[PDB]
RNA sequence: AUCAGCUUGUUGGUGGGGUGAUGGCCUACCAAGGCGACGACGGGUAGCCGGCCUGAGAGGGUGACCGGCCACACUGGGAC
RNA sequence: CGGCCAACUACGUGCCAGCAGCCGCGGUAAUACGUAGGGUCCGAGCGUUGUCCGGAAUUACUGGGCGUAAAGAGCUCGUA
RNA sequence: GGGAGACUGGAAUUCCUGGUGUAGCGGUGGAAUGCGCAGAUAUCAGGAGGAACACCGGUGGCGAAGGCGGGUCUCUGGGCAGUAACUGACGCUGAGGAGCGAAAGCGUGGGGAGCGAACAGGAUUAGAUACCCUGGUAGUCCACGCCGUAAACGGUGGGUACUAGGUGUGGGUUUCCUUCCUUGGGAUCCGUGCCGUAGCUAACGCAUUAAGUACCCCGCCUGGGGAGUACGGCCGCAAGG
RNA sequence: UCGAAGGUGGGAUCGGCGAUUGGGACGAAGUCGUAACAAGGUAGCCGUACCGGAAGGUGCGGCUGGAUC
RNA sequence: UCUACCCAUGGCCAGGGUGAAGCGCGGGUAAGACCGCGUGGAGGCCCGAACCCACUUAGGUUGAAGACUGAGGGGAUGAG
RNA sequence: GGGGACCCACAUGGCGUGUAAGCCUUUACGGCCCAAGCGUGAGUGGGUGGCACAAACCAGUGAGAAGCGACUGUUUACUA
């Protein structure tokens, strides 16, 4: 759950963490690890592509079976629900009957011992990936794909995931966490159940070291920025810039969504906030 | 709530004889089985205050019965508490 | 209790000194407890009693005089 | 010397000067203010003042109540 | 309708989408701020989301008290009648202590249809920082914690024994006119309304579900303000208690 | 060794005073107001939160110590 | 090849204290919460050298040095 | 605020280590103890010397208020 840390030092007074009692193994599988490195917020070209992030704690990579489609009709027990920091959620390894173990996203309330099926015959216990032909309308879903068989991309937020609304014709309607409705094929791949670590939103950061570890760099406010560096720069004292806030990269607040996407016709309306 | 099968099993198995039912031994046995079972239930169901009232009432009743057993005979009290494995 | 914990010779035992007399009265050595919500330790007041006044009684108030003790002798100590 | 409380009339100023333990007494005709008489009480003492009890069953053990005047804690389990 | 979790239903409001359909719709003691001519109101079809369950529904049931009601499942407490098998003084109340607790308020993270403090306008008045109208932010919903106060009222602590009745309701045992249908008649215990004796009370009034006559323990009160306030102590992150 | 007096240093209690401020009661009479007592012209009151010179107003929940029908 | 940032691979931090969760025992409960006792060394923790900085002062300022030296000064298991 | 040096006694004391030897066996580069030997802090008494017993080096000044900034951190290499 959530465990709050006692104030031993003035720095870690407010630090509270979601204790990971949901851990079973501590040393990740060495076979599936691929060579990875912190890119430092920089491309191969050497320029800093995005500031406020980079540096920190070098970490490893592991392949997740996001698009599980190659093998079907075989069951798998939950091997060990381990901790992968490269995601907000957790990964629970599976012993499939063919002996080919792949990592998958651990759904909410998953504990070691449940049997998971991936295919048409799969039931409604969480972790079962199956096309929309075999799912009731109205069930909460996660790790949702966009086409019948091109790899799953969406619905992997910890705690709130996409909810299926209804099927009409050959197009299916999906409700977004933002409260929006997206039209998607009735043959895409989607799983059942919410994603775990819902209590992760109750994490309290704590200090700056954790944050350089996590990746982000300290944020430099524009009002003290130099005027050449930023439109908010300059001033003798504290000033807001004398104009509406603007990213120093030229454009102010506003529309950024370029229309006319191939899935733009597959969207009914855009998000509305604070209702 | 206990039903006929296990309840008659308990009353006989902790009974002094095959006919007596209201003996303090059988009474404490029924109270203990009830409290462990329904405490297991309340480990899942948290905010059942109306049932925690039953917990407290049955526990005070139990405490009175155990006090009576200790008063009437130390040996039987010790035998009962040792056979059920509790603290007091 | 608009005072909840107090105490370290403090508590208990043994061995020594001590005093007219027993005794942590004093010393050494052993153990950790005694007193505590049937009001301890703290705070304010005040000499106690036979008596006096009041009240049918219960009770309340009080310690003039006398008398039975207690404590003091400008303040604090000590000893022959 | 108004009623509590046994003892009243006249004369002098009228919301002034003043009385007083509770109620309370004077705004031109006061048995309540001041003076006269007259009467009452007490008396070598007479009142004022302060402390204490009684009435105070007004801390109710004898001897009070808790619907509205003051009061049933919000209600249970339950240790001493 | 005792409590908790999950699943599920319909009506209604609002919003969105698409027809039809035209200059008004909403409003009060009267009118104007409000939305329309960019197509409102009305009305049909569909969808979305949140809250709460109209009738049954009552001076009726349960819970110790706050309180509790759309269905369904799951688990569970309390109470009642008969046989009375068994335990054989285990009963009661309970200072300090501990647990539950209307609404509002606070933190974190979600939800948020309707309603609605605060705040804007429009209206009345000499005056409105109100009563009225149009809007609507907390909150009202969910989970975890908190505060622990109400005219928290039956303004009456609990338990036991006794003391005339009449009239309704609910639950269960029996017996007899006996169709053996019948609130038929009778006996019994528990709960809950109304009116009434003796009695009590200053009166209103209570009257077997006592304020009647007693027993056991517990809290509270000693003229009105000051004042349920200052200081001190305890709890609470704070409001505060 | 003990030992009264004296001096070092910080904790409690009783206090006395203290600019100014907060609150209360008594004066009498004046302005601002209509709050409550009759369905007091918005039924009252209680707990609570917000608002306003002021009595008060509103929201939510609770009682009738509320009158008509 | 200094300095700013990042990337990958190595290395560095003498010594001394503070004592979280967890763990077992004895109380507390029916289960808790909680209460003490023994292990724990978690900490952008503490004191303090190597190391990295540059707060004060003096000297120097045609210096030993185109930014130091000498006394003190801060971090010193980490945003190093 | 107190003690801190040296010597003696308590003391052939306590502690660690561990041989000979002893105990044992799945007999081996084996477990238990361990006279002897080695190392060793701590305290209480008695006495002694100096002005001074952490005597050198090394090695926190402390306390009371109020402003800003929550704190550790980074920066104007070479005026802050
Ligand atoms: Mg913090
Ligand atoms: Mg990799
Ligand atoms: Mg290029
Ligand atoms: Mg950024
Ligand atoms: Mg790096
Ligand atoms: Mg993670
Ligand atoms: Mg910024
Ligand atoms: Mg700047
Ligand atoms: Mg520019
Ligand atoms: Mg530049
Ligand atoms: Mg500037
Ligand atoms: Mg300026
Ligand atoms: Mg802008
Ligand atoms: Mg959206
Ligand atoms: Mg049952
Ligand atoms: Mg002796
Ligand atoms: Mg002797
Ligand atoms: Mg003695
Ligand atoms: Mg001795
Ligand atoms: Mg006497
Ligand atoms: Mg008397
Ligand atoms: Mg008397
Ligand atoms: Mg006396
Ligand atoms: Mg005499
Ligand atoms: Mg004598
Ligand atoms: Mg003397
Ligand atoms: Mg003397
Ligand atoms: Mg007279
Ligand atoms: Mg007379
Ligand atoms: Mg006259
Ligand atoms: Mg005369
Ligand atoms: Mg008297
Ligand atoms: Mg009596
Ligand atoms: Mg009385
Ligand atoms: Mg009253
Ligand atoms: Mg009361
Ligand atoms: Mg109260
Ligand atoms: Mg629940
Ligand atoms: Mg339409
Ligand atoms: Mg419509
Ligand atoms: Mg909504
Ligand atoms: Mg028998
Ligand atoms: Mg009982
Ligand atoms: Mg009791
Ligand atoms: Mg009791
Ligand atoms: Mg008590
Ligand atoms: Mg009590
Ligand atoms: Mg509690
Ligand atoms: Mg609690
Ligand atoms: Mg509410
Ligand atoms: Mg609430
Ligand atoms: Mg608030
Ligand atoms: Mg909250
Ligand atoms: Mg929130
Ligand atoms: Mg509204
Ligand atoms: Mg309103
Ligand atoms: Mg506006
Ligand atoms: Mg207004
Ligand atoms: Mg109260
Ligand atoms: Mg109630
Ligand atoms: Mg009561
Ligand atoms: Mg009674
Ligand atoms: Mg009856
Ligand atoms: Mg009569
Ligand atoms: Mg009478
Ligand atoms: Mg009657
Ligand atoms: Mg009665
Ligand atoms: Mg009475
Ligand atoms: Mg007042
Ligand atoms: Mg008071
Ligand atoms: Mg205080
Ligand atoms: Mg004072
Ligand atoms: Mg003063
Ligand atoms: Mg006036
Ligand atoms: Mg009025
Ligand atoms: Mg009015
Ligand atoms: Mg009114
Ligand atoms: Mg009113
Ligand atoms: Mg109020
Ligand atoms: Mg209001
Ligand atoms: Mg209400
Ligand atoms: Mg009335
Ligand atoms: Mg430690
Ligand atoms: Mg712990
Ligand atoms: Mg230092
Ligand atoms: Mg320098
Ligand atoms: Mg110079
Ligand atoms: Mg030179
Ligand atoms: Mg140079
Ligand atoms: Mg230096
Ligand atoms: Mg110096
Ligand atoms: Mg240093
Ligand atoms: Mg540090
Ligand atoms: Mg650091
Ligand atoms: Mg050996
Ligand atoms: Mg041998
Ligand atoms: Mg062996
Ligand atoms: Mg000397
Ligand atoms: Mg610093
Ligand atoms: Mg810094
Ligand atoms: Mg720099
Ligand atoms: Mg500089
Ligand atoms: Mg520099
Ligand atoms: Mg500088």
Swiss-Prot record, chain A:
Keyword RNA-binding: yes
Similarity comment: family membership: Belongs to the universal ribosomal protein uL2 family.
Function comment: One of the primary rRNA binding proteins. Required for association of the 30S and 50S subunits to form the 70S ribosome, for tRNA binding and peptide bond formation. It has been suggested to have peptidyltransferase activity; this is somewhat controversial. Makes several contacts with the 16S rRNA in the 70S ribosome.
Basic and acidic residues bias (residue ranges): 252-267
Gene: rplB
Subunit details: Part of the 50S ribosomal subunit. Forms a bridge to the 30S subunit in the 70S ribosome.
Region (Disordered) location: 1-19, 24-57, 222-275
Biased composition (Basic residues): 36-57, 268-275
A Pfam family reported for this protein in Swiss-Prot or TrEMBL: Ribosomal_L2
GO biological process, alphabetically ordered: cytoplasmic translation
InterPro entries with a match to the protein in the record: NA-bd_OB-fold (IPR012340), Rib_uL2_dom2 (IPR014722), Ribosomal_uL2 (IPR002171), Ribosomal_uL2_bac/org-type (IPR005880), Ribosomal_uL2_C (IPR022669), Ribosomal_uL2_CS (IPR022671), Ribosomal_uL2_dom3 (IPR014726), Ribosomal_uL2_RNA-bd_dom (IPR022666)
Provenance organism: Mycolicibacterium smegmatis (strain ATCC 700084 / mc(2)155) (Mycobacterium smegmatis)
GO cellular component, one term: large ribosomal subunit
Disulfide bonds: none
HAMAP family: Ribosomal_uL2_B (MF_01320_B)
Keywords: Ribonucleoprotein, Ribosomal protein, RNA-binding, rRNA-binding
Molecular function as annotated in GO: rRNA binding; structural constituent of ribosome; transferase activity
Name of the protein in its database record: Large ribosomal subunit protein uL2
Curated annotation (Swiss-Prot), chain B:
Superkingdom of origin: Bacteria
Organism the protein comes from: Mycolicibacterium smegmatis (strain ATCC 700084 / mc(2)155) (Mycobacterium smegmatis)
Keyword Transport in annotation: no
The protein's assembly and partners: Part of the 30S ribosomal subunit. Forms a bridge to the 50S subunit in the 70S ribosome, contacting the 23S rRNA.
GO biological process: translation
SUPFAM superfamilies, A to Z: S15/NS1 RNA-binding domain
One of the record's GO cellular component terms: cytosolic small ribosomal subunit
GO molecular function: rRNA binding; structural constituent of ribosome
Entry similarity comment: Belongs to the universal ribosomal protein uS15 family.
Function summary: One of the primary rRNA binding proteins, it binds directly to 16S rRNA where it helps nucleate assembly of the platform of the 30S subunit by binding and bridging several RNA helices of the 16S rRNA. Forms an intersubunit bridge (bridge B4) with the 23S rRNA of the 50S subunit in the ribosome.
InterPro entries per record: Ribosomal_uS15, Ribosomal_uS15_bac-type, uS15_NS1_RNA-bd_sf
The keyword NADP is assigned to this record: no
Protein name (record): Small ribosomal subunit protein uS15
Classification via Pfam families: Ribosomal_S15
Keywords assigned by UniProt, alphabetized: Ribonucleoprotein, Ribosomal protein, RNA-binding, rRNA-binding
